[PDB]
Structure 1
Amino acid sequence: KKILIVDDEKPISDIIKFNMTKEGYEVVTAFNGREALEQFEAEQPDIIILDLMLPEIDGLEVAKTIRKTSSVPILMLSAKDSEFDKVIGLELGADDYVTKPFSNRELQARVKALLRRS
């Protein structure tokens, strides 16, 4: 399975990539919202892990745009942890929303759960 990891912070992207590589997934990365949409179109990932505070296009906009044409599972991963943040992310099309800092093991389990019901 292929996972697109969207995060502008390289250290965070690297940690998620390492953990997804350990699960046997193929990993593709994007460091801003524009790169996220370009990688989504070129790579057709099975699941997207999506940061929200991104340069060029924010994660909420990326999710809304992707949802116009695809039902690909989206797991938002952000430091934005308010009730409004989680509700808006889910209402715009996210299948899950995990807050930073996060557990690598829980992330793996949620990606598995999402792939299970998608």
Structure 2
Amino acid sequence: KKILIVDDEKPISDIIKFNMTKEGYEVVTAFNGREALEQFEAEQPDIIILDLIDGLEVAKTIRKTSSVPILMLSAKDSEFDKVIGLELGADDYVTKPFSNRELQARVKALLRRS
């Protein structure tokens, strides 16, 4: 399975890439909205981890063409934030800082379900 990680901070991208690789996924990365949409089109990931082009707008664009699972990750943890991510098409929304095991379990649940 192939995961696209969309994160503008290289430290957190590396941690998630490390942990997903350790589980046996193939990982592609993108560091802005433009690279995210290019990578999504060119790589056809099975799942996108897509921090908050602007994260809400990426997920909006993707859902125009694709039902690929999207897991949003964000330091923003208010009800407004979670609800709007989910309404714009996220399948799940996880806050930073996150537990590495929990993120892995949530990626697996999403993959199982699609």
Q: TM-score range by the shorter chain?
A: over 0.9
More helix by share: 2
- Provide the secondary structure at the position in 2 that maps to 1:3: strand
- Could you list the per-position Cα deviations for residues 46-97 of structure 1 after superposition, in whole angstroms to 9, with x for gaps in the alignment? 000000xxxxx10000000000000000000111111001000000110000
Structure 1 Cα separation of the partners of residues 44 and 73 of structure 2: 20
- Provide the secondary structure at the position in 2 that maps to 1:94: coil
TM-score normalized by the length of structure 1: 0.95
The list of structure 1 runs, each at least 4 consecutive aligned residues, that deviate by more than 4 angstroms after superposition, is none
Q: Does residue 70 of the first structure (1) align with residue 61 of the second (2)?
A: no
Superposition RMSD on alpha carbons, in Å? 0.4
Structure 1 Cα separation of the partners of residues 43 and 78 of structure 2: 31
Structure 1 unaligned blocks of 5 or more: 52-56
TM-score normalized by the length of structure 2: 0.98
- Provide the secondary structure at the position in 1 that maps to 2:18: helix
Structure 2 unaligned blocks of 5 or more: none
> How many equivalent residue pairs?
113
